[PDB]
Structure 1
Amino acid sequence: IANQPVVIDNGSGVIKAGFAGDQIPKYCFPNYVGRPKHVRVMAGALEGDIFIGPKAEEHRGLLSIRYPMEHGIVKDWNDMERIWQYVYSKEQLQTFSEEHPVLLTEAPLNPRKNRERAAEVFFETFNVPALFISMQAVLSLYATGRTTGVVLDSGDGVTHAVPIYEGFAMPHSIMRIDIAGRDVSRFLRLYLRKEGYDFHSSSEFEIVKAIKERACYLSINPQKDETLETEKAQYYLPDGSTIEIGPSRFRAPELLFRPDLIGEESEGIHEVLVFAIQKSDMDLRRTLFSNIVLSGGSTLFKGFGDRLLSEVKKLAPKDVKIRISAPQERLYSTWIGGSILASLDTFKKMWVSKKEYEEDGARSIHRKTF
């Protein structure tokens, strides 16, 4: 039973889905399970009471949105099961879980208990013939067509750097922080309360993400922007009310480089990228500096790569050629590589079959991933 396998790029913010050997993921929607805040009195209302995908994006104001997945660590399993059931349902894919093998994605250095429970869901609740969990950094390199390179990515949950050299991922040189898009949006929300405009509700949180996506830019010199007075640019909400954002728009994404602002003494994106290159072997460092691949959502800030370069110029050894490559399709780079990995003939050897899982269990899944 070797049908066209399904690639599901998991993540805290957004969940991409689709079939192998496609150019772009056709089925992208945000990873959350909205449930109604108000009491349905009238008949002919929205049926079901559990809303995932575009219906949730259309009817945000009704639904109390809550995310099941934080920092690449699923908290609520019942919600993730309903999301994966929605992916496979007739509203999006129009296929059965029994036909196709699955390609799953997870962030590196996650809990092994979550990986086991992920496999239990796909093998037992859904009746998948073969599952395969893989890393995001390896898939991003598949999408670019490279073999060498450090992979700085920044989704909604996790920011991590994986140094890989000619198809040799170094697990001990991996760095990781739990400071990413969601924490930047949460830090922006807190700053807008200091400005004046509060967005306390859970549906109203999605407005802060929309402000962060559109109206934010990373300044090169933060001390110079702090001394100067801002212009206070405007932004229109979904209602119509105007909002002067002020200095919060540039100070909000600075969380990624300075994680002491939120109150969590970590490295930062630029330090993680240097640390990953430093922890790797001496002869590989110069090739790892030249090949740096960007990915995820929080790399799409304005002047992000300019600041990332300037930070590497500050930290790294002098007279060394830095190159921070960035594709066009940075959000879908992790999915595209999965679709490439799925299409290859080697894919049949990498996966965990259903029969193999029934015999061994979790140990076979831990062996095949690494």
Structure 2
Amino acid sequence: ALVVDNGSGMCKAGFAGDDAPRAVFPSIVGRPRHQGVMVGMGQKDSYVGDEAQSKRGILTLKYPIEHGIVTNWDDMEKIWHHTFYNELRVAPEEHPVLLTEAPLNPKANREKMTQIMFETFNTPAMYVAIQAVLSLYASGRTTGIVMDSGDGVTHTVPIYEGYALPHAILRLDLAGRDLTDYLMKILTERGYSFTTTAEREIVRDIKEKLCYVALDFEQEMATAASSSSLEKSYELPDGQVITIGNERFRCPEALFQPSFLGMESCGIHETTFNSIMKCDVDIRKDLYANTVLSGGTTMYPGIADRMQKEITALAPSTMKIKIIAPPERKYSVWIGGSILASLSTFQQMWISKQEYDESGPSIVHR
């Protein structure tokens, strides 16, 4: 059977019988912005991400998912069309599929999602699972608190002996692009300017390479305020050199104390302590030492030490805390998806065509 994650900002897909996905691509949809100056087929009406990332410039770019909510289904159908016919070379009527979703999301999302999977692709069977649960599958633990943070969404689920406390789930719409744009805003301080969608991807790729979190914002600010050398140069695709200095960490700092982004909620560490504090007293000691980090926005170096230092300064003393931060976190959700698809006991749970034909899309509520 086939496992697809349409989680925000990049689709990942392959056979469930494997350890890693087969395709990984930006899910961007792009369209031409000028008339044709020379005759030929070369100008197709639309390009999907794996071409859309190459020809970027003459394309505008739109993201069909924002904050984990589909904004334009007609784009998404094109994306799935690419994933099925062009990449995995597989007929979707042959294989069952399961899909990721964010934990809290407008139910209409599920309804149309499964409607498309039946009424167009004629797929045999379907299931929608929340990402944090699947993340636990990849570690193979049965107790812990999962933190996942992707393009535009963060959430946490506490689970104990395989039971979630639904009253304890939180959203926090802080991550991803909402963080990337803060690098756009501050990078204009040095004078470099970046204005447009095709050009935003350069700043994203910088962020993907040259960023880390300070073990104390105050000391590293005082450091870079001194004449000490901490900057690294970067070269733009045109060969313009950039120097970035005093700013590789003042960016991700805004993931904490997020008043920089103007929000006034709690931040990541607050929300990790506040979720456990919605758990019963006798559970708490067991969720500590089992904070699991997940999703690509945890791949900054230094998050582990910062987070443990913060929580240990915030939680009651005498309680040991241990963050399970493996490598390969970028794949963890899909890895867990692969695991669940293989367990034979799960095979009764797929929604059948027969069920959809009685209940229609709302069957997703069982």
TM over 0.5: yes
Q: State the shift of 1:57 in Å.
A: 2.1
1:274 aligns to what SS in structure 2?
Answer: helix
Q: What is the alpha-carbon distance in structure 2 between the residues aligned to residue 84 and residue 268 of structure 1?
A: 34
Q: 1:237 maps to what in 2?
A: 236
Equivalent positions of 1:255-334 (< 5 A) are 255-334=254-333
Which amino acid in the other structure matches residue 324 of structure 1? I
Equivalent positions of 1:173-188 (< 5 A) are 173-188=168-183
Alignment match of 2:56 (pick from 46, 57, 60): 60
Q: State the shift of 1:45 in Å.
A: 5.3
2:4 is aligned with 1:8 = yes
Equivalent positions of 1:161-240 (< 5 A) are 161-229=156-224, 231=229, 232-240=231-239
TM-score by length of 1: 0.94
Deviates more, 1:201-210 or 1:34-43: 34-43
Equivalent positions of 1:333-344 (< 5 A) are 333-344=332-343
Which amino acid in the other structure matches residue 303 of structure 2? F
2:16 is aligned with 1:20 = yes
Q: State the shift of 1:269 in Å.
A: 1.2
Q: What is the alpha-carbon distance in structure 2 between the residues aligned to residue 298 and residue 133 of structure 1?
A: 23
Q: 1:249 maps to what in 2?
A: 248
Which amino acid in the other structure matches residue 76 of structure 1? N
Q: What is the alpha-carbon distance in structure 1 between the residues aligned to residue 71 and residue 254 of structure 2?
A: 24
2:78 is aligned with 1:79 = no
Q: Contact 2:111 / 2:362 at 8 angstroms: preserved in 1?
A: no
Q: Contact 1:176 / 1:272 at 8 angstroms: preserved in 2?
A: no
Deviation sequence 1:25-55 (CA, Å, 0-9, x none): 0111112101123333113353432111321
Q: What is the alpha-carbon distance in structure 1 between the residues aligned to residue 72 and residue 266 of structure 2?
A: 28
2:41 is aligned with 1:42 = no
Q: 2:349 maps to what in 1?
A: 350
Q: 1:108 maps to what in 2?
A: 103
Alignment match of 1:97 (pick from 92, 99, 106): 92
Q: What is the alpha-carbon distance in structure 2 between the residues aligned to residue 269 and residue 81 of structure 1?
A: 33
Q: Contact 1:234 / 1:243 at 8 angstroms: preserved in 2?
A: yes
Alignment match of 1:70 (pick from 57, 63, 66): 66
Q: State the shift of 1:236 in Å.
A: 1.2
Alignment match of 2:132 (pick from 130, 137, 156): 137
Which amino acid in the other structure matches residue 68 of structure 1? P
Q: What is the alpha-carbon distance in structure 1 between the residues aligned to residue 114 and residue 223 of structure 2?
A: 53
Q: What is the alpha-carbon distance in structure 2 between the residues aligned to residue 37 and residue 198 of structure 1?
A: 22
Note the residue ranges of structure 2 that are not aligned, 5 or more in a row: none
Deviation sequence 1:95-114 (CA, Å, 0-9, x none): 11211111100011111111
Q: What is the alpha-carbon distance in structure 2 between the residues aligned to residue 252 and residue 44 of structure 1?
A: 45
Deviation sequence 1:110-136 (CA, Å, 0-9, x none): 111111111111111221121100011
1:55 aligns to what SS in structure 2?
Answer: helix
Which amino acid in the other structure matches residue 130 of structure 2? M
Q: Contact 1:181 / 1:298 at 8 angstroms: preserved in 2?
A: yes
Deviation sequence 1:275-324 (CA, Å, 0-9, x none): 11111111111110111111101101121111111111121111111111
Q: 1:33 maps to what in 2?
A: 29
Q: What is the alpha-carbon distance in structure 2 between the residues aligned to residue 156 and residue 277 of structure 1?
A: 24
TM-score by length of 2: 0.95
Q: Contact 1:181 / 1:297 at 8 angstroms: preserved in 2?
A: no
Note the residue ranges of structure 1 that are not aligned, 5 or more in a row: none
1:293 aligns to what SS in structure 2?
Answer: strand
Q: What is the alpha-carbon distance in structure 2 between the residues aligned to residue 193 and residue 122 of structure 1?
A: 44
Which amino acid in the other structure matches residue 17 of structure 1? A
